[PDB]
Amino acid sequence: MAAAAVSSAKRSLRGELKQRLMSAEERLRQSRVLSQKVIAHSEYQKSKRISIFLSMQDEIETEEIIKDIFQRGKICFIPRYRFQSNHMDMVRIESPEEISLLPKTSWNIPQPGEGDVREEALSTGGLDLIFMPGLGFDKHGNRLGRGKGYYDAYLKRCLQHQEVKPYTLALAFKEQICLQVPVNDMKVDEVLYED
Numbered sequence: 001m002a003a004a005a006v007s008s009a010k011r012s013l014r015g016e017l018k019q020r021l022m023s024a025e026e027r028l029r030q031s032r033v034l035s036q037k038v039i040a041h042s043e044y045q046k047s048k049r050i051s052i053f054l055s056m057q058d059e060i061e062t063e064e065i066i067k068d069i070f071q072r073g074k075i076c077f078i079p080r081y082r083f084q085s086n087h088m089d090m091v092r093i094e095s096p097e098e099i100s101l102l103p104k105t106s107w108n109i110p111q112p113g114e115g116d117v118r119e120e121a122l123s124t125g126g127l128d129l130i131f132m133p134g135l136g137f138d139k140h141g142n143r144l145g146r147g148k149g150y151y152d153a154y155l156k157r158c159l160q161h162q163e164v165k166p167y168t169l170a171l172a173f174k175e176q177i178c179l180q181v182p183v184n185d186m187k188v189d190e191v192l193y194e195d
């Protein structure tokens with residue numbers, strides 16, 4: 001019952017948030033602001049092994065950050081989701097240009113296909129820094145995802161491979177910042193956002 005009330009609150013907020021999620025140019029504008037903030041960010045600059053998402057249209061565009069990741073010689077991993085469940089791995093990509101050749105999911109997001117053998121981040125040391133996607137975030141680092149809980153489960157696996165947990169950095173539109181995100185689940189270290 002209390003569980004259902006939480007679910008209801010999340011569902012309502014998701015609706016409210018997805019409504020808010022803007023022009024194409026404003027999305028690009030705000031993505032450019034965040035990329036600069038990211039490139040200037042201490043945790044990002046120091047990170048050696050990085051997980052980053054490939055942007056949907058209701059998400060901060062990560063294209064510029066991906067270019068920079070490879071320029072800084074970081075080891076770059078992207079999501080590969082198993083849609084049958086809440087399982088995801090982070091799989092290694094070797095250049096920004098590789099992304100353009102990948103097959104795409106029903107979300108129109110690139111990820112390596114079923115027969116494509118990939119280095120999984122947890123097989124080779126884990127991650128220093130994970131960029132956290134989501135529908136909404138509050139100033140306490142509470143995250144509202146799409147409902148499937150992939151990132152929550154992934155973070156718990158990271159604990160089994162690393163003495164120190166990966167730093168988690170959320171990238172948000174101004175429109176994605178909420179007063180209170182209803183919660184059960186796992187906070188992000190920092191939410192970046194502004195005009």
Ligand SMILES: [Mg+2]
Binds near residue numbers: 020021022026173175
């Ligand atoms: Mg927007």
Ligand SMILES: [Mg+2]
Binds near residue numbers: 060
């Ligand atoms: Mg976008």
Ligand SMILES: [Mg+2]
Binds near residue numbers: 081082083
């Ligand atoms: Mg699948």
Ligand SMILES: [Mg+2]
Binds near residue numbers: 087088153157
């Ligand atoms: Mg997993």
Ligand SMILES: [Mg+2]
Binds near residue numbers: 100101102103
């Ligand atoms: Mg393709």
Ligand SMILES: [Mg+2]
């Ligand atoms: Mg697999």
Ligand SMILES: [Mg+2]
Binds near residue numbers: 177179
């Ligand atoms: Mg609010």
Ligand code: NI
Binds near residue numbers: 088090
């Ligand atoms: Ni992995």
Ligand code: NI
Binds near residue numbers: 087088089
């Ligand atoms: Ni797997």
Ligand code: NI
Binds near residue numbers: 149
């Ligand atoms: Ni998730």
Ligand code: NI
Binds near residue numbers: 140179180
């Ligand atoms: Ni509060």
